[PDB]
Write a protein that binds this ligand. Sequence first.
Ligand SMILES: CC1(C)CCC(c2ccc(Cl)cc2)=C(CN2CCN(c3ccc(C(=O)NS(=O)(=O)c4ccc(N[C@H](CCN5CCOCC5)CSc5ccccc5)c(S(=O)(=O)C(F)(F)F)c4)cc3)CC2)C1
Length: 139
Amino acid sequence: YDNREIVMKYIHYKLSQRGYEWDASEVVHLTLRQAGDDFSRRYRRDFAEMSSQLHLTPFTARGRFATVVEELFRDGVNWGRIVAFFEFGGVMCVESVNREMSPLVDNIALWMTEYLNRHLHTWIQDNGGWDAFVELYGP
Ligand SMILES: CC1(C)CCC(c2ccc(Cl)cc2)=C(CN2CCN(c3ccc(C(=O)NS(=O)(=O)c4ccc(N[C@H](CCN5CCOCC5)CSc5ccccc5)c(S(=O)(=O)C(F)(F)F)c4)cc3)CC2)C1
């Protein structure tokens, strides 16, 4: 499955729900959206803390993203951390819009796509690909 499309559909949906029409395998997209909503409710303190402590500006966004992503996957990968990675990118995009720095969304989407293609892709494929994530979540 194309990771770039997965990132784009995911971010696009999150922003559209804030009235922001961003100028940017259906089961996979819907499943990821649901798993991410579940993650953010089940781990609300983490979600809420990250959201309020970003201190996001165009000068720091890339460094904050790199730092958090390296910390997230430090002890290895699992599907829950992959969902957390998407929700973190979503928090970054959402905060960028809230702070009137919406152009950052494009950079964020690229960094997410790159990290998936360069660092998560092998793990994902070794686990059977996104079909495995779909099965695990249900469908
Ligand atoms: C260092 C740093 C600061 C870095 C940055 C950062 C951070 C801070 C803010 C933000 Cl915003 C982002 C990141 C943190 C914060 N940290 C990040 C990691 N966090 C994790 C917490 C739990 C797991 C886990 O549990 N991982 S797991 O064991 O692999 C597993 C288990 C169950 C399910 N899904 C089930 C679904 C069951 N069905 C539902 C449908 O009805 C049928 C039954 C439950 S919902 C569900 C439950 C959990 C996850 C997703 C969905 C899935 S999953 O959905 O991915 C699936 F199923 F595999 F697909 C996978 C992995 C990591 C904890 C908090 C730390």
